[PDB]
Amino acid sequence: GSNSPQEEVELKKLKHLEKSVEKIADQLEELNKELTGIQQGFKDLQAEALCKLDRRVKATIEQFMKILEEIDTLILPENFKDSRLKRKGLVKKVQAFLAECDTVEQNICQE
Amino acid sequence: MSKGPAVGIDLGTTYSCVGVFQHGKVEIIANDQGNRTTPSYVAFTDTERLIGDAAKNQVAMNPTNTVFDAKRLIGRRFDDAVVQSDMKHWPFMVVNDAGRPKVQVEYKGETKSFYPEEVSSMVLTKMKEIAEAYLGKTVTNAVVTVPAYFNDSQRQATKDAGTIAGLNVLRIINEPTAAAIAYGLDKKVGAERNVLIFDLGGGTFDVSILTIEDGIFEVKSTAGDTHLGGEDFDNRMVNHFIAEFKRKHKKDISENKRAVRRLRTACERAKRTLSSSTQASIEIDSLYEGIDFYTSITRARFEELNADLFRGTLDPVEKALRDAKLDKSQIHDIVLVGGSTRIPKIQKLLQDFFNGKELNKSINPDEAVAYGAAVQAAILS
Ligand SMILES: CN1N=C(N)c2c[nH]c3ncnc1c23
């Protein structure tokens, strides 16, 4: 129980990053709904619609990558246990969303 | 919007800068993203054309249709050794239209080709709009810089880029001349001043020697490397860490592009820290195969990893003094230009080469050219 005010500053940065991750995760969810929409919604139009979703998944992957890069600027002393735990969990959350992004890429613009 | 003053624009290979002389001083103008320098990048998408920061930010997403390095093509013929060698690296297409190079892209779902001066005009239009947004006034008159070695076709092509952008190009001045102007080296007492300009920025390395007599510039020699900069130094720290990760975890992170990028981005930031500190730390969580990478690097190791690249900068300096028929003792002023001149080792080697002589380095190295071009624009109009 040695929580410092200095750690509050670091936790605040991570919280903002968590909010940015949820915004990008919502865009991924909408992309998923659109994908479901195309695959069962009445040729060359389908291909154009899926490779338009491709640009959008690529944009989603890029936003998740720029979040990781911002997280990688953090230096958290070993005694900032709460901040190190929160940073570790957010990286893992982003990495699981990237694996989902990759699955969408594995299913679209294929031959 | 009322009538605005004349501006100085440094049209770089990777980044451009715009300055204005007002209230007895030059102010370097920040763009819409608050950056004092703007990427010389143009992106062509399914619905829009992006310039600057907006174009650089989606390069990963749209590599084929994101044009950069138009400065390496401007005013050249298609069969130029430079055009044939440089296009090997570029992810976008460079085609031939009657002996002239043209960048071929996908714009609004249609195949389109633009001349290098048309691409530079779009960058110049952005620099003009950046100036207009800051001053809240219309901007027409401008001085644009070019490297001293640029020929007649390269110089006219840059003037055409400014004309297509709607600018009245006052003069095309040499980048080393602009840097020398920024430091007011032409207003110093004496008969004749020999100036060496050391320019290490935006992917190229340029050494120029100039002579100033009663404020008149003469280009004595030029030497350098058209492919040398921060990216090469960054590459050396990336290899160092990849090797460290192999020794500690017996895992090769090199084929995982995302892992390499996270490490590269951390290295580019660590290199900046090492210009003001003697050590930099990096903490990357779940870098590769869920393994956390927490490490550090000292300035000494960083210098050691790049020892050849840093010492190698001196050779062009030797070549320029040889062509200019001058001894190193004959050099009156040394000017440091470009972001990588911030590196203490490069500064140490250049002061040790010129026997403890002081360097002109107080003006921001990435901004010195735009600074002098702004001084020149306020005189010309
Ligand atoms: C501190 N700093 N800041 C920079 N903006 C920069 C660009 N290239 C550099 N090389 C070394 N050190 C740098 C830089």
Coordinates of all heavy atoms in Angstrom, one line a residue, chain B residues 10-16 37 69 71-72 147 149 175 197-207 224-233 271 313 335-343 346 364-367 369:
Chain B
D10 N 11.0 25.3 -47.9 CA 12.1 24.3 -48.1 C 11.4 23.1 -48.6 O 10.7 22.4 -47.8 CB 12.8 24.1 -46.8 CG 13.7 22.8 -46.9 OD1 13.9 22.3 -47.9 OD2 14.2 22.5 -45.8
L11 N 11.5 22.8 -49.9 CA 10.8 21.6 -50.5 C 11.8 20.4 -50.4 O 12.7 20.3 -51.2 CB 10.4 21.9 -51.9 CG 9.6 20.9 -52.7 CD1 8.3 20.6 -52.0 CD2 9.4 21.4 -54.1
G12 N 11.6 19.6 -49.3 CA 12.5 18.5 -49.1 C 12.0 17.2 -49.7 O 10.9 17.1 -50.2
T13 N 12.9 16.2 -49.8 CA 12.7 14.9 -50.3 C 11.6 14.1 -49.5 O 10.7 13.5 -50.1 CB 14.0 14.1 -50.5 OG1 14.9 14.8 -51.3 CG2 13.8 12.7 -51.0
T14 N 11.7 14.2 -48.2 CA 10.7 13.5 -47.3 C 9.9 14.5 -46.5 O 8.7 14.2 -46.2 CB 11.5 12.5 -46.4 OG1 12.4 13.3 -45.6 CG2 12.3 11.4 -47.1
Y15 N 10.4 15.7 -46.1 CA 9.7 16.7 -45.4 C 9.9 18.1 -45.9 O 11.0 18.4 -46.4 CB 10.0 16.7 -43.9 CG 9.5 15.5 -43.1 CD1 10.2 14.2 -43.2 CD2 8.5 15.6 -42.2 CE1 9.7 13.1 -42.5 CE2 8.0 14.5 -41.5 CZ 8.6 13.2 -41.6 OH 8.2 12.2 -40.9
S16 N 8.8 18.9 -45.9 CA 8.9 20.3 -46.3 C 8.6 21.2 -45.1 O 8.1 20.8 -44.1 CB 7.9 20.6 -47.5 OG 8.3 19.8 -48.6
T37 N 7.2 20.8 -39.6 CA 7.7 20.2 -40.8 C 6.5 19.3 -41.3 O 5.8 18.7 -40.5 CB 9.0 19.4 -40.7 OG1 8.8 18.2 -39.9 CG2 10.1 20.2 -40.1
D69 N 9.2 11.1 -52.4 CA 10.5 11.2 -53.1 C 10.3 11.8 -54.5 O 11.2 11.6 -55.4 CB 11.1 9.8 -53.2 CG 12.0 9.5 -52.1 OD1 12.1 10.3 -51.1 OD2 12.6 8.4 -52.1
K71 N 11.0 14.6 -55.4 CA 12.2 15.5 -55.5 C 13.3 14.7 -56.2 O 14.2 15.3 -56.8 CB 12.6 16.0 -54.1 CG 13.7 17.1 -54.2 CD 13.8 17.8 -52.8 CE 15.2 18.4 -52.7 NZ 15.2 19.5 -51.8
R72 N 13.3 13.4 -56.0 CA 14.4 12.5 -56.6 C 14.1 12.4 -58.1 O 15.1 12.0 -58.8 CB 14.5 11.2 -55.9 CG 14.9 11.2 -54.5 CD 15.2 9.8 -53.9 NE 15.5 9.8 -52.5 CZ 16.8 10.1 -52.0 NH1 17.8 10.4 -52.8 NH2 17.0 10.1 -50.7
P147 N 18.6 21.7 -53.9 CA 20.1 21.5 -53.6 C 21.0 22.2 -54.6 O 20.5 22.4 -55.7 CB 20.2 20.0 -53.7 CG 18.8 19.5 -53.5 CD 17.9 20.5 -54.1
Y149 N 23.5 21.2 -56.3 CA 23.9 20.4 -57.5 C 22.8 20.3 -58.6 O 23.0 19.7 -59.6 CB 24.4 19.0 -57.1 CG 23.4 18.3 -56.1 CD1 22.3 17.6 -56.7 CD2 23.7 18.2 -54.8 CE1 21.4 17.0 -55.8 CE2 22.8 17.5 -53.9 CZ 21.6 16.9 -54.5 OH 20.7 16.3 -53.6
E175 N 19.9 25.5 -51.1 CA 19.7 25.1 -49.7 C 20.9 25.6 -48.8 O 20.7 26.3 -47.8 CB 19.5 23.6 -49.5 CG 18.0 23.2 -49.9 CD 17.9 21.8 -50.3 OE1 18.7 20.9 -49.9 OE2 17.0 21.5 -51.1
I197 N 28.9 23.8 -45.5 CA 27.5 23.5 -45.0 C 27.4 22.0 -44.9 O 27.6 21.3 -45.9 CB 26.4 24.1 -45.8 CG1 26.5 25.6 -46.0 CG2 25.1 23.7 -45.3 CD1 27.7 26.0 -46.9
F198 N 27.2 21.5 -43.7 CA 27.0 20.0 -43.5 C 25.5 19.7 -43.3 O 24.9 20.0 -42.3 CB 27.8 19.7 -42.2 CG 27.9 18.2 -41.9 CD1 29.0 17.5 -42.4 CD2 27.0 17.6 -41.1 CE1 29.1 16.2 -42.1 CE2 27.1 16.2 -40.9 CZ 28.2 15.5 -41.4
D199 N 25.0 19.2 -44.4 CA 23.5 18.9 -44.4 C 23.2 17.4 -44.4 O 23.4 16.7 -45.4 CB 22.9 19.5 -45.6 CG 21.4 19.5 -45.6 OD1 20.8 19.1 -44.6 OD2 20.8 20.0 -46.6
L200 N 22.8 16.9 -43.2 CA 22.4 15.5 -43.0 C 21.0 15.4 -42.5 O 20.7 15.3 -41.3 CB 23.4 14.8 -42.0 CG 23.3 13.3 -41.7 CD1 23.5 12.5 -43.0 CD2 24.4 12.9 -40.7
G201 N 20.1 15.4 -43.5 CA 18.6 15.3 -43.2 C 17.8 14.8 -44.3 O 18.1 15.0 -45.5
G202 N 16.6 14.3 -44.0 CA 15.6 13.8 -44.9 C 16.0 12.8 -45.9 O 15.7 12.9 -47.1
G203 N 16.8 11.7 -45.5 CA 17.2 10.7 -46.3 C 18.5 10.9 -47.2 O 18.9 10.0 -47.8
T204 N 19.0 12.2 -47.3 CA 20.2 12.5 -48.0 C 21.3 13.1 -47.2 O 21.0 13.6 -46.1 CB 19.9 13.4 -49.3 OG1 19.5 14.7 -48.8 CG2 18.9 12.9 -50.3
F205 N 22.5 13.2 -47.7 CA 23.6 13.8 -47.1 C 24.3 14.7 -48.1 O 24.7 14.2 -49.2 CB 24.6 12.8 -46.5 CG 25.9 13.4 -45.9 CD1 25.8 14.5 -45.1 CD2 27.1 12.8 -46.1 CE1 27.0 15.0 -44.6 CE2 28.3 13.3 -45.6 CZ 28.2 14.4 -44.8
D206 N 24.3 16.0 -47.8 CA 24.9 17.0 -48.7 C 25.9 17.9 -48.0 O 25.6 18.5 -47.0 CB 23.8 17.8 -49.4 CG 22.8 17.0 -50.2 OD1 23.3 16.2 -51.1 OD2 21.6 17.1 -50.0
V207 N 27.1 17.9 -48.5 CA 28.2 18.9 -48.1 C 28.4 19.8 -49.2 O 28.7 19.4 -50.3 CB 29.5 18.2 -47.7 CG1 30.6 19.2 -47.4 CG2 29.4 17.2 -46.5
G224 N 28.7 14.3 -51.1 CA 27.8 13.7 -50.2 C 27.3 12.3 -50.7 O 28.0 11.6 -51.5
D225 N 26.2 11.8 -50.1 CA 25.6 10.5 -50.3 C 24.0 10.8 -50.4 O 23.4 11.3 -49.5 CB 25.9 9.6 -49.1 CG 25.6 8.1 -49.3 OD1 24.5 7.8 -49.8 OD2 26.5 7.3 -48.9
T226 N 23.4 10.4 -51.6 CA 22.0 10.7 -51.8 C 21.1 9.7 -51.0 O 19.9 9.9 -51.1 CB 21.7 10.6 -53.3 OG1 22.0 9.3 -53.8 CG2 22.4 11.7 -54.1
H227 N 21.6 8.8 -50.4 CA 20.9 7.8 -49.5 C 21.6 7.5 -48.2 O 22.2 6.5 -48.0 CB 20.8 6.5 -50.3 CG 19.9 6.6 -51.5 ND1 20.5 6.9 -52.8 CD2 18.6 6.4 -51.8 CE1 19.5 7.0 -53.7 NE2 18.4 6.7 -53.1
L228 N 21.5 8.5 -47.3 CA 22.1 8.4 -46.0 C 21.4 9.3 -45.0 O 21.2 10.5 -45.3 CB 23.6 8.8 -45.9 CG 24.3 8.6 -44.6 CD1 24.5 7.1 -44.2 CD2 25.7 9.3 -44.5
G229 N 20.9 8.7 -43.9 CA 20.2 9.5 -42.9 C 19.9 8.7 -41.7 O 20.4 7.7 -41.4
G230 N 18.9 9.3 -40.9 CA 18.4 8.7 -39.7 C 17.9 7.3 -39.7 O 18.1 6.5 -38.8
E231 N 17.3 6.9 -40.9 CA 16.8 5.5 -41.1 C 17.9 4.5 -41.0 O 17.6 3.4 -40.6 CB 16.0 5.5 -42.4 CG 14.6 4.8 -42.3 CD 13.7 5.2 -43.4 OE1 13.2 6.4 -43.4 OE2 13.3 4.4 -44.3
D232 N 19.1 4.8 -41.5 CA 20.2 3.9 -41.5 C 20.8 3.7 -40.1 O 21.2 2.6 -39.8 CB 21.3 4.4 -42.5 CG 20.8 4.5 -43.9 OD1 20.6 3.4 -44.5 OD2 20.6 5.6 -44.4
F233 N 20.8 4.8 -39.3 CA 21.2 4.7 -38.0 C 20.2 3.9 -37.2 O 20.6 3.1 -36.3 CB 21.3 6.1 -37.4 CG 22.1 7.1 -38.3 CD1 21.8 8.4 -38.4 CD2 23.3 6.6 -38.9 CE1 22.5 9.2 -39.2 CE2 24.0 7.5 -39.7 CZ 23.7 8.8 -39.8
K271 N 16.9 6.9 -30.2 CA 18.0 7.7 -30.8 C 17.8 9.2 -30.5 O 18.8 9.8 -30.2 CB 17.9 7.4 -32.3 CG 18.9 8.2 -33.1 CD 18.6 8.1 -34.6 CE 17.3 8.8 -34.9 NZ 17.1 8.7 -36.4
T313 N 31.0 10.2 -42.8 CA 30.5 11.5 -43.2 C 31.6 12.5 -43.5 O 31.5 13.3 -44.4 CB 29.5 12.2 -42.1 OG1 30.2 12.4 -40.9 CG2 28.3 11.3 -41.9
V335 N 28.3 25.2 -41.0 CA 26.8 25.2 -40.7 C 26.3 23.8 -40.6 O 26.4 23.0 -41.6 CB 26.0 26.1 -41.7 CG1 24.6 26.2 -41.3 CG2 26.7 27.4 -41.9
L336 N 25.6 23.5 -39.5 CA 25.0 22.1 -39.4 C 23.5 22.2 -39.7 O 22.7 23.0 -39.1 CB 25.0 21.6 -37.9 CG 26.4 21.3 -37.3 CD1 26.2 20.7 -35.9 CD2 27.1 20.2 -38.1
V337 N 23.1 21.5 -40.8 CA 21.7 21.4 -41.3 C 21.2 20.0 -41.3 O 22.0 19.1 -41.6 CB 21.7 22.1 -42.7 CG1 20.3 22.1 -43.3 CG2 22.1 23.6 -42.5
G338 N 20.0 19.7 -41.0 CA 19.3 18.4 -41.0 C 19.3 17.8 -39.6 O 20.2 17.9 -38.9
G339 N 18.2 17.1 -39.4 CA 17.9 16.5 -38.1 C 18.9 15.6 -37.5 O 19.1 15.6 -36.3
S340 N 19.7 14.9 -38.3 CA 20.7 14.0 -37.8 C 22.0 14.7 -37.3 O 22.9 14.1 -36.7 CB 21.1 12.9 -38.8 OG 19.9 12.2 -39.4
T341 N 22.1 16.0 -37.6 CA 23.3 16.8 -37.1 C 23.2 17.1 -35.6 O 24.1 17.6 -35.0 CB 23.5 18.1 -37.9 OG1 22.5 19.0 -37.8 CG2 23.8 17.8 -39.4
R342 N 22.0 16.7 -35.0 CA 21.8 16.8 -33.6 C 22.6 15.8 -32.9 O 22.8 15.9 -31.7 CB 20.3 16.6 -33.3 CG 19.4 17.8 -33.6 CD 18.0 17.6 -33.0 NE 17.1 18.8 -33.2 CZ 16.2 18.8 -34.3 NH1 16.2 17.8 -35.1 NH2 15.5 19.9 -34.4
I343 N 23.0 14.7 -33.6 CA 23.8 13.6 -33.0 C 25.1 14.1 -32.4 O 25.9 14.6 -33.2 CB 23.9 12.3 -33.9 CG1 22.5 11.7 -34.3 CG2 24.8 11.3 -33.3 CD1 22.4 10.8 -35.5
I346 N 28.4 13.0 -34.4 CA 28.6 13.7 -35.6 C 29.2 15.1 -35.4 O 30.2 15.4 -36.0 CB 27.3 13.7 -36.5 CG1 27.1 12.2 -37.1 CG2 27.4 14.7 -37.6 CD1 25.6 11.9 -37.4
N364 N 17.2 25.7 -35.4 CA 16.8 24.3 -35.5 C 17.3 23.7 -36.8 O 17.0 24.3 -37.9 CB 15.2 24.3 -35.4 CG 14.6 22.9 -35.5 OD1 14.9 22.1 -36.4 ND2 13.8 22.5 -34.5
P365 N 18.0 22.6 -36.8 CA 18.6 22.0 -38.0 C 17.6 21.7 -39.1 O 18.0 21.7 -40.3 CB 19.3 20.8 -37.5 CG 19.1 20.8 -36.0 CD 18.6 22.1 -35.6
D366 N 16.4 21.3 -38.8 CA 15.3 20.9 -39.7 C 14.7 22.1 -40.3 O 13.9 22.0 -41.3 CB 14.2 20.1 -39.0 CG 14.7 18.9 -38.3 OD1 15.2 17.9 -38.9 OD2 14.5 18.8 -37.0
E367 N 14.9 23.3 -39.7 CA 14.2 24.5 -40.0 C 15.1 25.6 -40.6 O 14.6 26.6 -41.2 CB 13.4 25.1 -38.8 CG 12.5 24.1 -38.1 CD 11.8 24.6 -36.9 OE1 12.2 25.6 -36.3 OE2 10.9 23.9 -36.5
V369 N 17.0 26.0 -43.3 CA 16.8 26.2 -44.8 C 15.6 27.1 -45.0 O 15.7 28.1 -45.6 CB 16.9 24.9 -45.6 CG1 16.5 25.2 -47.1 CG2 18.2 24.3 -45.5

